[PDB]
Amino acid sequence: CSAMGTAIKKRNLEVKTQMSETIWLEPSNNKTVYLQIKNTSDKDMSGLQAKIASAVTSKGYQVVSNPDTAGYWIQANVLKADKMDLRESQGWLSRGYEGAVTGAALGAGITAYNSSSAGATLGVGLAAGLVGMAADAMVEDVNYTMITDVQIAERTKTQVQTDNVAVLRQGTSGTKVQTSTETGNQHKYQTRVVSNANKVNLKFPEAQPVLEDQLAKSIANILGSG
Amino acid sequence: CSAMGTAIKKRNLEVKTQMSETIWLEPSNNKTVYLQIKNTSDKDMSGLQAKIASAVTSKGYQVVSNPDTAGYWIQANVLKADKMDLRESQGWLSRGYEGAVTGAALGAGITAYNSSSAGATLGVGLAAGLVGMAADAMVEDVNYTMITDVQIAERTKTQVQTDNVAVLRQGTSGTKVQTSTETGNQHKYQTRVVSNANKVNLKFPEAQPVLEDQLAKSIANILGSG
Amino acid sequence: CSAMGTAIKKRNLEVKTQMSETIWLEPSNNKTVYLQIKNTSDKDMSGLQAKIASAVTSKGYQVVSNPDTAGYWIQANVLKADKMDLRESQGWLSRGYEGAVTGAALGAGITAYNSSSAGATLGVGLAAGLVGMAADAMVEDVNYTMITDVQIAERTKTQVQTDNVAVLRQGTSGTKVQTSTETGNQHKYQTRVVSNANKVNLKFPEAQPVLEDQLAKSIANILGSG
Amino acid sequence: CSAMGTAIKKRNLEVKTQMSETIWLEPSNNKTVYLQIKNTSDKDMSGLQAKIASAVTSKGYQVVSNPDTAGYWIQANVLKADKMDLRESQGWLSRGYEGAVTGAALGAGITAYNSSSAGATLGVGLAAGLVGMAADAMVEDVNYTMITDVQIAERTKTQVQTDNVAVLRQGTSGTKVQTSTETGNQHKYQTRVVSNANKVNLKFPEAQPVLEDQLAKSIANILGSG
Amino acid sequence: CSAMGTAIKKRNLEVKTQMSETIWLEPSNNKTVYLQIKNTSDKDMSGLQAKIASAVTSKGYQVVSNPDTAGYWIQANVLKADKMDLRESQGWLSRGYEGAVTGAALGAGITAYNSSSAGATLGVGLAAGLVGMAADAMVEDVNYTMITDVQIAERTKTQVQTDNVAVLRQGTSGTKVQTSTETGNQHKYQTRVVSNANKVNLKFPEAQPVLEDQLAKSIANILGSG
Amino acid sequence: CSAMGTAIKKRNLEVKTQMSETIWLEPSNNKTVYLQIKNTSDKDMSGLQAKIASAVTSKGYQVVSNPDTAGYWIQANVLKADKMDLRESQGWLSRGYEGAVTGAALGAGITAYNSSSAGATLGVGLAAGLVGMAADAMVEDVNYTMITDVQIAERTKTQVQTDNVAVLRQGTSGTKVQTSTETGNQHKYQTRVVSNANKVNLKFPEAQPVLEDQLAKSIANILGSG
Amino acid sequence: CSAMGTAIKKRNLEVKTQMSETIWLEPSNNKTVYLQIKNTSDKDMSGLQAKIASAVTSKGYQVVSNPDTAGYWIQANVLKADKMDLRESQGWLSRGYEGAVTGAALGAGITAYNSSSAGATLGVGLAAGLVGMAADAMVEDVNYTMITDVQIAERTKTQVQTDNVAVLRQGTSGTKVQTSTETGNQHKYQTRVVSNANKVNLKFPEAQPVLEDQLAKSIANILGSG
Amino acid sequence: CSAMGTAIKKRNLEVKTQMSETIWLEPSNNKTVYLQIKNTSDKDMSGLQAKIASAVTSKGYQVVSNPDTAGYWIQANVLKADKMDLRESQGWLSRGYEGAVTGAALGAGITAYNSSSAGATLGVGLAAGLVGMAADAMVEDVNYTMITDVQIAERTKTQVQTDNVAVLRQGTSGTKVQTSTETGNQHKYQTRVVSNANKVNLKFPEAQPVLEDQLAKSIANILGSG
Amino acid sequence: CSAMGTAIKKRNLEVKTQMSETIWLEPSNNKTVYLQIKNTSDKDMSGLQAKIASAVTSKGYQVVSNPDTAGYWIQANVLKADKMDLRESQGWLSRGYEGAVTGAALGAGITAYNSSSAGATLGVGLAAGLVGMAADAMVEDVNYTMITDVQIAERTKTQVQTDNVAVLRQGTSGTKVQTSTETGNQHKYQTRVVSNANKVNLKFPEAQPVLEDQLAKSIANILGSG
């Protein structure tokens, strides 16, 4: 059974968290960190801010509420979240066909037993095939993919020139190009973290705590155990 | 049955809302937001503007009606909406063929019963096959895809130069290139939100409230819980 | 039956209207709109101008007949219209083959009845197969695709320079390049609206009113509920 | 029968006329139009100029014979015309094979009747198969595709510089590049109109009147109902 | 029979003539035309010059023999001509296989008749199969494709600079680049005309008159009915 | 039989001659032509010079032996000649397989005749199959493809600058770039002529006269009937 | 059995560690190394820092805690870690199908033994097939792929100019370009190390010690046995 | 038999010689030619230089041994020579399989004759199959391809500047770029000649004389019959 | 047998030696050559240097040991050598499968002989199949491909500027670009020679003498028979 094979394979929650690329930070004596965590996804990660703060404080850093007097900024946005069924990557044999067959066959388990009436065996076989198809189709091999954008700002003594260049699309024909220049002492680096939570019939509120834990640990480990 | 498998799989409304990319906003003391929400799609989202206003006010911001004295602009356009049937991605076994066969076979359930007249059984089998094909073809696995364009304007102290460059197509041969330059204190950033509402025999007015709720929450969360 | 499945699936008129991209307009106090609606398609949309005017007036704008003293221009052209049959995307099984077979088989419904004469049954079976093929081939699953070009002109205080650049093809060898420069206070943005009207045996005059209604609502909603 | 299915499907003349791109014209008080219509195709469209003149005059414009004092020029060229059979897109089953089989089988309709002589039945079956193949092959599902080039010249007050640049090919090795510059007050825009006339066994003189009517209406509607 | 299907389908001569692109000519009072028609093809079009002259004179123009005092030049070259059999696009079933089988079978039409001697029937069947293969292979579905290059020179008042740039290949390694500059009052535009003559067992001398007629009409119509 | 089909199809010599592109020559009063014909191919075309001279003289030109005082140069090089079997484009069924089978079967034409001895029939069948394979493989469907390079030099009054640029390859690593500049009054244009001679078991000396005739006529017709 | 084949093939832990490219270091007398090891992966490598320190000290270098007075910097980041099952590269035959069949067949090992009751044999066969499918699906051929980024900084006497160029993405439309310039005496080179740990039913904590050992040896060997 | 078909097809030596591109030489009064013929191929062409000298002298030129006072240089290098079997383009049926089968079958030609002993017939059949496979595999359809580089130097009065540019590869990382400039009165042109010698079981010393003859004739004909 | 077919086909050593491109050398009076032959391949060519010296001396040149006073340099490096089996290009039928079958069948040659005991025949058949598979797999159709780099330096009177440009890769991130300029009177040209030695069960020491002979002859023939 494909459904039972999936239910056996992915029987326990499996969470993966992969940073896209490395952000290199010079050794520094800064201890203050300012956190700005946002969530533009349909899923709920409300404890991610507190978990990032706790992980950062575990490394000796101090979380401050004043962005101007903070050596580091951790700007994170839980940008996206998608849910997919991996079984559908197999096309057919995933809509309950084999689940209906296994159960249409089991309906013949009444012919060799008490009642072998043709109408009765047909009815029981049909009901068993329907129940088998329902059980096969109700096995959801769900994978939640989350995409988080991270932007670390480190305060330096070097004058950094920011050149904002926005190309705003304007109706299939034009663009409005906005350009501006600012000067400040802050190097900003970006990165992306991709999280995955896989399980059979997985409901997101079960995967949310571990997802937040791993994401917070990764984002805090960007700073390293200073 | 493929139709019944679909009706079981997608039996409850499933709404997804995914922002395209992250708009980074500096920590600010601005509290005023001006909303400009438009809808150039055939579907109806009349409550989206009010839901965005409520979500923004929940974060401590204040929605104002004067665009000139607003620290933030949320300009949103529900640009597009499409409806498709996902079953049609399977080609055949989606036009009622298998639903006709399941029912043409069930018409033989009269031969082994009261009347086994050849004309009667043929007629009942044909009617049952027609009804099965109709029921299979009437199972619509509908997916509504919505595209919303968001444009956030943040008022700054930096002089921003906007260079409008429109390349208007002119009859398969030419272009009229319009260029202009303006100066103002407003950085404009764009982004795109893709919404999906999936269900069996889904009617849009059922999916509209949750679609608006999720879209409003995402667009407001762009500003973050300031 | 493929024909019957199509007639069941697309039994009621389905109209879609999708704008290509968003035209962003700054908040403004302009209330005057000038409409220029043209139709270079073989289909007839004569009521589109009045419907656009009514939809625009519903938003508080005022439609004027003087292009020079109009804050906004709505220039629309119903550029193209095509009609196709979607069943032909399936290649064969859509020219009446299966509709002929279903009916050639039904011609055997005379052998088991009053007259089983070989000539008579052959003739009735042939006539029934011909009628079945005709009925299958007469089921038209028609989709009208309409392309409209929209050009919104908004009057500004910024000097706008228009550089007309036309590359006129000249006989497989040359081009005449026409260049000119104009100055005026009007930003012109473009966009495209794609309409679809789908039904079984759909005749365009039935789809035209709703097509115009949706197109007018979309084009007027470009301006937003000002 | 594929031939019969085609004869049923495309039983009445179907004419389509699609402009390639939109030519945008500013609102103007010009009322004079000069028409220059040419036909470098093997087909005959002699009434096209008169139909364009009538359609233009219906919009309030006035057709003049002096190109120098005309606000608008409508320069049209019926460049190309091709005729194809769409059945040949199916490869085989379109050269009379199935039409021969349907008729070779019908030749057996003499064995069960008056004369069942082996020579006689063979001869009648062969003749019937030949006639069936001839009738199937004589069913022409013809599509006429016509390509028209349109060049609208609008007289302006802006000085327009035309830079003629012709790259004349010279024997697989060279090019003669002719360049010249002229100055005049006329913006020239181009566009293309594609016409299709589809029917079974369609003869062009039947499709020519409606083809001209639709083409003239489209080209005149370029000017819009001024 | 594929051969019979071809002989029925393309039973009468079909001539097509398609100009590549449009050459736009300004309205002019010139009436003199100078013709220079050449033929570097293996086929013969000797009457093309006279037919072009007649068609041009029918439009009111006057054909002159002095190139210097001619308002228009019509320079045409019948560059290429190819002959192909379209049946060979089907690969096999076009070399006489099926024509041999149809006739090998007909050789059995002697067993059921006067002499059924094994040697006699084998010999007659072999001869009939050979004759059938010969007749099938002797059915030529011929298509003549002709390519003509046209170069129209129109005398203007604008000074036209011709920059001859020839890149003469020199033995797999080098090029001799010849460059020169001339000045004259003549705009030269090019174009290409593709002619097709299709028929079963078509001999070119039958297709030549109509081919010349259509080509001359097209090239003359480049000038338009001035 | 594939061999018989080929021998019937291509039973008479078929010669094609196609110029690559058109060389445009201005109307001129020059009457002197200088011919330089070379042949770097393995085939023999010794009469091509005389045939070109005769064709040129037929047009009123005069062939001269002094290159300096010749208005026109016809420089031709019969660069390449290849011979191929077209039957081998079919892969198998062209090495004698079917020719062996047709003849292995004909060896059974001795069993039903005078001697039906197993050894005798086996020997005769083997010999007949060998002879059939030999006859099939000895059917050569030969196509000679010839490539000629033509270079026409026309004497003008315009100063022509020739920039010789040769990039001589030097051992997989280097190039010696030779550059030089000359000035002379002669425009040189190139072109290519592709000839084909097709027949069954064609020997080149049979195709050479007509090949030369067609090539000479084409190259001379480059000049046109002046 | 595919599961048995996997369990036999990959029965013992196999660890691979491959550096991407070579970092060339000049011969030097520096003996001080500063280590900065971070881990932004979900896996745990806490002993990697100590192992790198031990391996470096084995080569004669001295690990220091002051980054400013260190001749060498070893900056390493265990960026990513993924876990996959290689059996799934075979598609089917890996979800327990063949493991179910091997065991459904073994359930017939009760018919030829003590109890051959149809119900009993069916039940035992079903249970054995379920157990076989479970055992097949419980065989995990796991491969852990770890990606580490290494950045070696070597202190020189040459002035090194660092030009920070960050292109921060801003919402699908814009980029903020940050540019800065610093000067210092430190050449920084990068590289990447890819580690793999393969085994059947491998749990990461078993592979972690050897993974750390190999990674530390490789990163330390970058410095060479100085 | 494929082997016998090949031995029949390519039974006599077939030599082809094709120049790559044309080297155009101006008409000249030079009569002195200097030959430099080299052979860096494994094959032997020792008589090529003498054959080129004889062919050149046949055209009226005079071969000289002083390169400085020679109007023309013919520099030729027989660069490459490869030998291949064309039968191997058919994959199998070319290693002796079918030749083994034809002979394994012929071993049954002893059962119906004097000795039908099972051991004897098996042994004779095996020996015959081995001999047939050996004979089939010993049929070599060999094609020798030769590549010759030709460099013609023509002495002129124009100053020719040679810019030697050699990019010498240096160990997967670098290049040494050598550049030099010389001035001399000699235009050098290149070209390539491809020779083919095809036959069954062809040994090169048989094809060498004709190969040299054709190559010499082509290279000498570059100069033309001056 | 595939193995026997290979052993028959490639029964004698076949050596090919192909130079990549031609190095053109001007006629010169230099007679001194300096040889620098290196071998960075795993194979042994120790006699190549002496063979090159002998071949060069055979042409009249004199081999010198002083690089500074040598008109020519022959710098050669036997860069690479690979050994492959061509039979593996056929995938299966080359690992002994067919060789096992031919021999498993021959094991049945004991049933029809003295002992037909089932155990005895099974054992003898298994042993014969094993021996056949071993003999098939022990037939090695080996091809040695050798790559030699040649660099000819010719001393000139022209000043040659060498621009060394080395781009040394530095750890997946950087490059050290080394540039230098030298001046000397020596043109250096490169080329590549590819050698192949093919035979069944070929051992390199048997192919080495002929490989060296051919390579030396080719490299010496670069200089030509001066």
Author numbering:
A (entry chain A), B (entry chain B), C (entry chain C), D (entry chain D), E (entry chain E), F (entry chain F), ...: 36 to 261
From the paper:
Following transfer of IncF-like plasmids, recipients become refractory to a second wave of conjugation with the same plasmid via entry (TraS) and surface (TraT) exclusion mechanisms. SFX, which is mediated by the OMP TraT, is specific for Gram-negative bacteria. TraT is a highly expressed ~24 kDa lipoprotein with a copy number of approximately 29,000–84,000 copies/cell. In this work, we determined the cryo-EM structure of TraT encoded by pKpQIL (TraTpKpQIL) and the F (TraTF) plasmid derivative, pOX38, at 2.47 Å and 2.66 Å resolution respectively. This revealed that lipidated TraT oligomerises into a decameric champagne cork-like structure, composing of a transmembrane α-helical barrel domain and an extracellular ring domain.
To gain insights into the molecular mechanism of SFX, we purified recombinant TraTpKpQIL from E. coli OM vesicles in CYMAL-6 and determined the cryo-EM structure. Analysis of the purified TraTpKpQIL by mass spectrometry confirmed that the first cysteine of the mature protein (C36) is modified by DAG and PA, which agrees with previous reports. The map displays 10-fold symmetry corresponding to ten copies of TraTpKpQIL. Each TraTpKpQIL protomer consists of three amphipathic TM helices (α1, α3 and α4) that anchors it to the OM, a central β-sandwich domain (β1–β7) that is flanked by two α-helices (α2 and α5) that protrudes to the extracellular space; β5 and β6 form a β-hairpin perpendicular to the top of the β-sandwich domain. Each protomer associates with one DAG molecule, where interactions occur exclusively between DAG and its own protomer. DAG is found in the interface of the TM helices α1, α3 and α4 and forms a hydrogen bond between its diacylglycerol moiety and the backbone of T137. The decameric structure is predominately stabilised by interactions between the extracellular domain of the protomers; the α-helical barrel domain does not display significant interactions with adjacent protomers. The arrangement between the β-sandwich domains, including the β5 and β6 intertwining, results in the formation of a cyclic architecture that consists of an inner β-barrel with a diameter of 48 Å. The conjugation frequency of pKpQIL into recipients expressing TraTpKpQIL was reduced by a log-fold, −3.6, compared to the baseline level of conjugation, −2.5, in the absence of TraTpKpQIL.
